[PDB]
Motif scaffolding. Structure first.
Motif, PDB file in Angstrom:
ATOM      1  N   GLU E  53       1.023  -1.059   0.029  1.00  0.00           N
ATOM      2  CA  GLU E  53      -0.024   0.103   0.029  1.00  0.00           C
ATOM      3  C   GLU E  53       0.824   1.368   0.035  1.00  0.00           C
ATOM      4  N   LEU E  54       1.915   1.292   0.450  1.00  0.00           N
ATOM      5  CA  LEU E  54       2.954   2.379   0.845  1.00  0.00           C
ATOM      6  C   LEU E  54       3.610   2.540  -0.608  1.00  0.00           C
ATOM      7  N   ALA E  55       3.972   1.466  -1.484  1.00  0.00           N
ATOM      8  CA  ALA E  55       4.346   1.483  -2.683  1.00  0.00           C
ATOM      9  C   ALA E  55       3.570   2.288  -3.439  1.00  0.00           C
ATOM     10  N   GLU E  56       2.092   1.996  -3.331  1.00  0.00           N
ATOM     11  CA  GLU E  56       1.072   2.621  -4.265  1.00  0.00           C
ATOM     12  C   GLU E  56       1.082   4.233  -3.915  1.00  0.00           C
ATOM     13  N   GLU E  57       1.120   4.459  -2.570  1.00  0.00           N
ATOM     14  CA  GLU E  57       1.042   5.914  -2.063  1.00  0.00           C
ATOM     15  C   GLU E  57       2.253   6.800  -2.544  1.00  0.00           C
ATOM     16  N   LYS E  58       3.504   5.945  -2.555  1.00  0.00           N
ATOM     17  CA  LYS E  58       4.536   7.019  -3.092  1.00  0.00           C
ATOM     18  C   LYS E  58       4.562   7.071  -4.663  1.00  0.00           C
TER      19      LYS E  58
END
Ligand SMILES: [Ru+3]
Ligand SMILES: [Ru+3]
Ligand SMILES: [Ru+3]
Ligand SMILES: [Ru+3]
Ligand SMILES: [Ru+3]
Ligand SMILES: [Ru+3]
Ligand SMILES: [Ru+3]
Ligand SMILES: [Ru+3]
Ligand SMILES: [Ru+3]
Ligand SMILES: [Ru+3]
Ligand SMILES: [Ru+3]
Ligand SMILES: [Ru+3]
Ligand SMILES: [Ru+3]
Ligand SMILES: [Ru+3]
Ligand SMILES: [Ru+3]
Ligand SMILES: [Ru+3]
Ligand SMILES: [Ru+3]
Ligand SMILES: [Ru+3]
Ligand SMILES: [Ru+3]
Ligand SMILES: [Ru+3]
Ligand SMILES: [Ru+3]
Ligand SMILES: [Ru+3]
Ligand SMILES: [Ru+3]
Ligand SMILES: [Ru+3]
Lengths: 173, 173, 173, 173, 173, 173
Positions: E53-58
């Motif tokens: 989910e962090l990969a997507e946010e960044k």
């Protein structure tokens, strides 16, 4: 006087009144543009509507500035609105070029007011501009640049056809 | 020029442009009235809204005139809008008196334009005014007279109380 | 210590704790105002509710500041809350004047904290204040000024009647 | 003075004001507890919420007492709120022990006030306490005792794991 | 060139491009973290999903920066994305420590860009960062600190059990 | 090591990691294409969206490969992603030609991996490629060929008009 005014310089108050005038003048320019493109001998409905909608947006900008002037305890002062710079606006390209010029002048006025507010340590003003005006203006200028590019691509050596197509296929009414 | 213009005199065309200017000037006056009554040291919300709504109505009148100017094959010509006659508008009574004066001047301009159209045998113009402007203006002037009467009754020797009550009980926001 | 703290000065941390105390003190003042106007011998229900709602808003302001203090890796430190400056608050006009004074002091504290954050190059803090506090406070102070004006207009030489009417017709419960 | 006061001793009136202060002080203590457990280096969300909800409940207790003080024709008098007894609250066990101590002191204050009301033959007061405070406090103290027991069972020689599990499985957020 | 660019320094333009690269690099690091925790011999589903989910946010952060670069009339320039700093990420604690380090570096880059914008009197940029990036990053770093604390509490002398429980009870998939 | 790995050669494992890199590189190329066509001086919204959607699809291809690598007990290994081959992508025709070239290289990589899997008697791999990648790629390349043909037909000697029309009438946003 004011029972509410706090951290609100006379310099910012006067500059707010001047910006109101610039927004109302821009609204008036757009009203003229809108009606020019509604002429029977121009007849570009989508172009007309684009400028008519901008007239409304700029009046709304002025009204937000006036509301804020009262929220801060400043006093609205109105001056004449100078009529628009042209009576006839040429082609859609001429008009969109004139619109971008007008918007860059409004943007520069916003930036100048922001700088005044920073100089005066007026963060409310700075926030107000950032939150309701600076990004709205950047978005609008980007949209006008996108239009200008598409208009320019369509000129070629068949300018009438390109002007019709832009109005029909980009600015759907 | 015009490919559509028919039975549309240069005299009516110019008078239409002048009436547009008078309506836009009236709109601007109402914008000023609206913001004056929103001042923290005036603070009569219902009065403010009454004038703000009139600003919108007068702009709409101008836009209908401009639309008709194009429908007839005339050419919109804009002039400066003179700033409103006052910077501060006094009491609600002062303001409503100023509003009735302004409206009587607009009405007289409508009547003068109608007379020009009759002289020029321009029934479309005559109908346009009758159908969108003359009765609207009579209704508005009647409403302002009704207000003035109620405002005047409330002055007595307790003017503040009467001004508050009128705003609260007649002009509900 | 902190595993998360970044660009968060000890000066801002301490000033945040002081502002929390000022907001909680303001909440307490409003709690006292609210209950004073609920006394059987004062009995102005709308006034009571106005101040009671402000007590809640100021507690919420304090809680937002405390949440942010933890988000930044600072440490909440609480001090005594000084009781409100009066035990009895006089008329609605006296109370609204006291409320505006209190709010101007909170606003000045916000502005002082913002200036500290600018000096410390702490944009998160600056944004936090701009986004949750500065405009909320300007709006509230404008509303209090509008009230004060209406209260003052209603005094005249029939002060009881004016106080009743303001409560009934402006501050509907 | 009072036009409504009946069977309401000055002794009960003053004791009501003191109990208000004790409830508001308890609310403040819980606010501090709530934010301590929200620290990045404590980070026990369920514990935080438990204490935050108690802060709200104790403020509501104070507000009910204040409402009753006015219903009886007494006069609310506020004093300083002493800051909470600690700045850092230790483990969940330390905190829950501190909470039970605080609640037993509030309960004893309720019981002391009830006894005063009985001595003063003030059945309204007695009923008010019985109906809104005494059973609520017994229920709360029982719940805290149940928590303390579960917290204590979980310590063993793996205290971190037990503290995490209690927060996750008993105090779901 | 640009027909729209206004108040947009070459220094900010280049720094925006560098920040894009840093966000895309962070996205890539998170993609690697996400897949490491999905390995059959690691198998911590909740941890995997948190990083995914962090990969997507960044990536979304990078895309917002790129959109703004075009809105301002700047030119996106892409460079290589350096592969992540590790091929295997150790325990959940090791990974969360690495994530906080990465986020503090991104935050410092945001703060450095904000400072450049202030130096260049570029309020649009300053607002853009404040409004879409600075608070989002503070919230994320706070959440990671909260996690690190809970992970650390669970280690004790039964590290496997604590790692399983954190994944099951904090990071529900 | 692996407790699950079965019939999964080191050669296929490494080739899967290389294909991941090729898909992520393709995603990055498409991200660059997407933003180039969003430039104010290019401004072909439909073209931008076509490439932006491809960036997403290629990232999804990479993520499916990574998921499978873990399902088989292989170990994901990431390398640098080389920046895209151009900073500016020319006309829509230039861009679509570059896209077809890129896709043919991805397709050839898929076919090479399939051949490796056949050589290694790895039917799971063969099925995985057949079922999620080979037909998707053939469909995409067919769609790009169809586009290229329509773009080419529209060039003629009025290239701007043709580029506008393709974007408006084929790639509706
Ligand atoms: Ru139309
Ligand atoms: Ru600023
Ligand atoms: Ru706003
Ligand atoms: Ru139309
Ligand atoms: Ru209003
Ligand atoms: Ru007639
Ligand atoms: Ru009609
Ligand atoms: Ru209102
Ligand atoms: Ru009430
Ligand atoms: Ru600031
Ligand atoms: Ru927020
Ligand atoms: Ru009520
Ligand atoms: Ru929580
Ligand atoms: Ru009893
Ligand atoms: Ru009850
Ligand atoms: Ru929670
Ligand atoms: Ru999973
Ligand atoms: Ru800034
Ligand atoms: Ru935005
Ligand atoms: Ru799962
Ligand atoms: Ru688009
Ligand atoms: Ru096969
Ligand atoms: Ru499948
Ligand atoms: Ru689009």
């Amino acid at each position: 006087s004011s029972q509410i005014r706090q951290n609100y310089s006379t310099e910012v108050e006067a500059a707010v009144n001047r910006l109101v005038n610039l927004y109302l003048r821009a609204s008036y320019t757009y009203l003229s543009l809108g009606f020019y493109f509604d002429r029977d001998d121009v007849a570009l409905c989508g172009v007309a509507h684009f400028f008519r909608e901008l007239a409304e947006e700029k009046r709304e900008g002025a009204e937000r500035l006036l509301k804020m002037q009262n929220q801060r305890g400043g006093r609205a002062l109105f001056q004449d609105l100078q009529k628009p710079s042209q009576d006839e606006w040429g082609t859609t390209l001429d008009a969109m070029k004139a619109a971008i010029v007008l918007e860059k002048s409004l943007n520069q006025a916003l930036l100048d007011l922001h700088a005044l507010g920073s100089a005066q340590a007026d963060p409310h003003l700075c926030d107000f501009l950032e939150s309701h005006f600076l990004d709205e203006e950047v978005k609008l200028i980007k949209k006008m640049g996108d239009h200008l590019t598409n208009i320019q691509r369509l000129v070629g050596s068949q300018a009438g056809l390109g002007e019709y197509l832009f109005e029909r296929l980009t600015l759907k009414h």
